């Protein structure tokens, strides 16, 4: 397994009929989500892991006993405000022993806001897809023979800001954790290689008056030279992850093509050129379509008589 | 796997044809047992559980053997009355040596009303909504082609309160283990972080009159910063789980929308605007409809007929 | 996998087309046995489980191995008569060292009946069950379309007390199993803590004259406080399985509605009200029936029928 | 796992369409084979097996590498005829070291007679219960229509003994290996447990003239404890096995009803209450029918007639 | 897993829609392979291995480094012709070294047999059999409506000895392989058991000059008590394979009935009683077709006449 | 698992509808590659690798961890020109460390020419038999039934050697990576035994000054004694590979059967006996029908139509 396990897991495959999330927004999430994952578990791959988290240097006389109650006091002594001396203060120490679960909550806080779009708006979206496409293969199939329901429907959902503002505010959360991390990670790859080095005492209670003990052992956090390193990593495709997910707001500019252009070759259609320019659920509806509609028969035979066009008898012919 | 596992297993998956659960309860039930399960596999990761949950400071006269002896026996010790000194008292040692455990009982006793509610009441439940739901197929269906049995059905069910007792005794029960829980991670996470160490002793018995060993051992509970960090994660989203469990009592509020007047449009149906104030189970039917009924065929056709009213030969032309 | 894995093992699974066993004969057995294989699992997870069952203070000047040949000696010595002392007598040594056994012999003791009943009983159900569904969806099919061969059959099994007997005697071996695992546990929970201490001694045969080695090593069995304590969790739990037990010999009782009453609404059916207050076989298949036939087309459209009656003509609208 | 996963895996589960072996041999093969695999792995588990099976009290001036020499080589030296001494002689040290593998032994000695059974006569009788089940099916069929071809089969396998010498010498092969075992395993719960404990040495070779080397070592085989408890276990359970396996050979009184007699209602069939006191396989085949044929329709159809009956127009109308 | 998992990997299961193998090569070839391979796995479960496979007597001087030096070295000697002593010679130092690998050996050299059947024999033999049942159906359809390609075939085959070369000679290396395998393990069953003792010397290159090192150590093969105790085991069984394989040779003994007797009750059919006591491959034909044709329908009716008869109309009455 | 588990893996599944390789060159391949797999596997198999592939006789007073550093560091150093003496030379220390990379290297090289044949001539054949097959079915039904397409097909591939260059090319390499892989087998099978032993020196950089340290370090590489034995198994095998190997190439040698004569007795073929003796195209497609084409239906009837022969009528009776 080693480490091209990983690359396996969370690189070659989709860990995470209708296409019901945009491209765009899966592959933002699955980098979002899949890459602190990912640096986790190479952080504490025993390919460079040599061993446990911390070592102190305890005194030659100390039993191998006592040395590994020192080590394992002093692991517990890093979140503790009296046991400990060093010179950036106790805050780094905390970050250096928990940097596993702060990547684990950036992961889960990333993940959230898709998984509370597959269930708050992906079934109501669901629905309506299909109803709008199999309404468009029927203008079609009366073109292909020769009530505007789905245009009286659509030109009803241009009246409504209901579902856009549901996708809108679960980009805005993705994209405030990601500028979040981006300050955290900048602030934790900032700390002085040396905060992995603190002074601990064992001196409390009983052990106080030992004087066999000395007054301080220096330890030191083996990890930290990785976590640093990884969350350079992890700040700079984040940091590439922020204009994408601005773009993602841009709705009215990233409608590609005017697909129903292609429809409203017919004579059985209407002039839906609704570019609503305008944040309005129709708008949102047409990335969705420009997303799924591809699959139609319909569509695929009107593109290419609308390409060649660049007749509809021809369409017998197809 | 390390952490990214418990990722995948417990975040990315539902570990846990009719929808016979709420989503709001599904939800608050994921969560509620959810998490401490993932807490607690947090919380002994090896990328953060160092070795042993004890260790104490033998004498450096002491073999290897005696002071795996003096740890072994002082795990032993936490919860022996007389083998202990804290200045806390012997209780935060019990929970602290116990976490694990209390933590898994919480996860369980949120588990069982959602058990209970899928044995006592979903099979009593499944079989009336089928029912209802292909009867207003046929109210639809006779619609198209031009006895009230189902509006006297659910005109009976309104005078019932027996699966709406089921239900509400089953959210209390949630909403009382949410909230013993919430008081339990509160005193815990107060718990002084010095009472992980204690004094113990191994004189007991024939060792009692050895002056070659020393009155006091000094111990510490390694683990036990973890664990205070985890519950106060544990306390703050079982903290916000809290007004959801309430919300859910509020049953005849939770109706979103009078779905049945999308059918009283129709001739051949009646004015079934039955939103009981009062707690009847027909109320708890409506919740359960508006959850299942978005798949109906019918439903979407004349929702569709609705929002552009917002004329029967239209149905003819879908 | 952790403690977490536990859980969706044994409480998240049903780890053990007819419903040929009571819901409450499932739930009792599957918690019966159930509980204890979970509960061993927790008293050896590495959660809590710090190293060895148990350890041995031995003297400071023998060798590491000496010392691993005096704990695993006395491993052994705790069920041999003579190399012992303790205040409580030997006893309670063998409980402690064997209580992961003892749960498991009662665990399976608890599931015995319950595969008896799958295979002295259930097939020679299943049979009758089947065929008394179809020959009451012909009484059903029959009225509708306007020999008492099903009444004269159910009038047959009226007289016997076959099954009935095979039941009860099932339940009653589970009772007993049961009464006796809380009696045992309840001792077990009754040993002083201490008696997981002992005094152990080596000097049999050869070493029996060597001044070097002490006369008595003493000896703790770490895991007995998990033990102990996860003992009055199995003891709480059965004593509150016990009065459900009881219950489930009051089969006369237990019929909850007259089903067959629904199907007497029509003149092609007969009085079989036939509660049988008597312990006989019929009685027994009511519950069998009022678990299956909610199942049945004919019992739903019945139902209804009753329900609001609370005509014959209605059953063709449907 | 731990032991838990031992009861999912030989309890819970049937780890060994028509039913080719009879439900009671079934169970004894199934008891008899699955006990032993079962109790060689409890005897193991890591619960109670504390670590090595042999430990010797080496010297304590020897180095950890000449004490883990003396107990490897005291382990071989076990089965070595001239290095040891024990007062019970060499016997029963073989016995103990090699108690799983024996039995193992018995485990696959149990179970070779039902895989000789599956193999040289389950596919020669399956055949001609398919025969006759399809015949009868025709004689029922005929009659409710209204050559002797199965009942002149029948009558000639009455001329048989081929099938049942395989059966009984099957059941007689089985019997025997239960016995043995039975006397074995009540010759090993009698060694005292002090045979466990015998002297070593190392004086063999170059090490031979070397004073500073003792001239024995005290060992001990820790794990003797279990495997003389589970041997009782197992004694236990093969001691109730045995007059169930012999009641097995009484054929012609285990045919519990004269089934035929169901169809010998018919006045298309014949007088075939060929109950053979003698042991001919047509009586063997009797059992088989018994155990198969409940699920013919035919037989479900005509014994409700004879219970009841306890007239063919009746048939018309089930 | 322990033990009971190789039971059920290699006795209860067949690790290894026409029978193209014979039963009895099955299981010869079977429990040839599967029972080294099951002895290998047993010779290794650490349920009975202790450790490692040498151990060394090291002087108390050596460090802990020292000693693991001297076994490792030695476990290397055991091959090396100048660095040893043995009164046995070296030559039984390498057996008891590579017994497993040895065993393995046996276990492939008597699979190959069978593997060069699958594919040497068993397709060209495949397409015949399908030929001749489907012709001998047609032969049976026949004579219910009621040239001679099939039997023509047939005596074609009877001119031919190809098939009938393969199977003896796979038959033959089979046989030899077993009986040299016989005489290997009785040849290491006779190894004195102290034959698994030798003397290492370390002295080779930089070390022969040391005044500190002995000139040797005593060694021992601890896992040798064993292989030669599974040896014998292994030695028996073949012994009991020998005479089975010989067997084998005489097919046209082996012939066990002349089942186109029973075709040749028919009138369509031709004396085909063409037992060739001459080795043709006919004669092996026949015994893949008495291996075979008890699954054809045409066989079981007229088998059961034949029976019977031991009327041609009765045929249109089964 | 063990050594068993390999058999399994390795030998008794082909772990590597038309059959694209040739059963010889399927059966080479799967030797070439399959056996040096087998062979690492068993190198490395606990039941036989001691521990580490290193261990060296530091002094006395070192430390376990200097011990450490000394095995450590000269397993660094057997690929390090100045750190190293041997009287071999340097060169043997790479191959006895390297040992199974360079197997892993020969089983990749056999490897990839069936890869090139699966996915540069595979496709390109697979097309052209379906087209021949199925033509052939209809030369065979148009007889029955009673333009030469495929054999102006077929003489026109006679004019081609485009597959033959890719075949024969495969199988050459094939040949010369056998005949490296024996040449390299022999010479390290031929390195003398006490190569596996070598000085090494840890006197670099700042040690180069410590009069503590010994100028030279013995070690021995303790898995040579292994490799040396299985490259002797390795090299055997596959001089047995080389002559079937080279019979390869005698393709028009190797066409058994004039299988198209079966054909040319049907008047509607023609005398396609075209044995190339020159090396073109047609005459490997005559090796790869003489694969497949026993499994046409008509040639299954003409060949028992010739053998008998060895009319057009009897077809009809088939």
């Known amino acids: ?4 396990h990983l690359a396996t897991e969370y690189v070659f495959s989709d860990f995470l009929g209708l296409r019901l999330e945009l491209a765009v927004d899966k592959m933002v999430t699955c980098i979002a989500v899949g890459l602190p994952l990912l640096l986790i578990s190479l952080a504490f791959a025993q390919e ?3 061993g446990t988290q911390i070592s102190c ?3 030659s006389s100390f039993s191998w006993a006592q040395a590994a109650f020192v080590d394992s006091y002093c692991w517990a002594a890093v979140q503790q405000k009296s046991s400990l001396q060093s010179e950036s203060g106790n805050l780094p120490l905390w970050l250096h022993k928990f940097f596993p679960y702060i990547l684990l909550l950036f992961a889960i806080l990333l993940y959230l806001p898709a998984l509370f779009w597959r269930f708050s708006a992906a079934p109501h ?3 309506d897809l299909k109803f709008i496409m199999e309404e468009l293969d029927k203008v079609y199939n009366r073109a292909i023979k020769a009530y505007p329901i789905v245009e009286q429907y659509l030109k009803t959902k241009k009246n409504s800001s209901h579902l856009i503002m549901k996708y809108i505010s ?3 959360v993705t994209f405030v954790v990601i ?3 981006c300050i955290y990670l900048s602030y ?3 700390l002085s290689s040396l905060s992995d080095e603190f002074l601990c005492s064992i001196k409390s209670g009983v052990l106080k008056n030992d004087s066999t003990i000395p007054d301080r052992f220096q330890c030191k956090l083996i990890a930290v030279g990785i976590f640093q390193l990884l969350s350079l990593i992890n700040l700079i495709v984040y940091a590439l992850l922020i204009p994408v997910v601005v773009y993602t707001f841009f709705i009215p500019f990233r409608q590609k093509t005017d697909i129903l252009k292609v429809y409203e070759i017919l004579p059985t259609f209407d002039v839906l050129h609704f570019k609503s320019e305008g944040y309005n659920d129709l708008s949102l509806y047409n990335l969705f379509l420009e997303e799924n509609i591809s699959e139609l028969k319909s569509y ?3 593109k290419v008589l609308e390409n060649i066009k660049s007749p509809m008898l021809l369409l017998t012919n197809l």
Chains 1, 2, 3, 4, 5, 6 share one sequence.
Do not use: D, H, N
Request: proline residues 4%.
């Open 1 to 4: 397994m080693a480490i091209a």
């Open 48 to 50: 460079i892991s040599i």
């Open 179 to 181: 500028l979040l991390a």
């Open 188 to 190: 934790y790859f900032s």
């Open 300 to 302: 695929k035979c009107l």
């Open 57 to 59: 240097f305890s005194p």
């Open 125 to 127: 979206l669901c629905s």
């Open 170 to 172: 679960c980009r805005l």
